[PDB]
Amino acid sequence: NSYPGCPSSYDGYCLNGGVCMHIESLDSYTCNCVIGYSGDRCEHADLLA
Numbered sequence: 001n002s003y004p005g006c007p008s009s010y011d012g013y014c015l016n017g018g019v020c021m022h023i024e025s026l027d028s029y030t031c032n033c034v035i036g037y038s039g040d041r042c043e044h045a046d047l048l049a
Contacts, residue, residue, distance in 0.1 A: 016042045 006020035006029065014020060014031035018041070021030055033042035 013041055016045070018042060 006022060012018070014033070016037050017034045018031045021032055023030055031042075036045060036047045038044065038046055
């Protein structure tokens with residue numbers, strides 16, 4: 001009857017446009033990243049200009 005939301009102890013895990021998204025199906029925690037980022041936690045930027 002509520003949306004607890006993602007935890008706040010991971011220390012901003014997802015970086016560079018990291019929107020926490022709790023998947024009920026997979027039953028896990030994932031984050032959405034933009035194109036260009038792939039490095040661990042989308043930390044590294046792989047911009048193609």
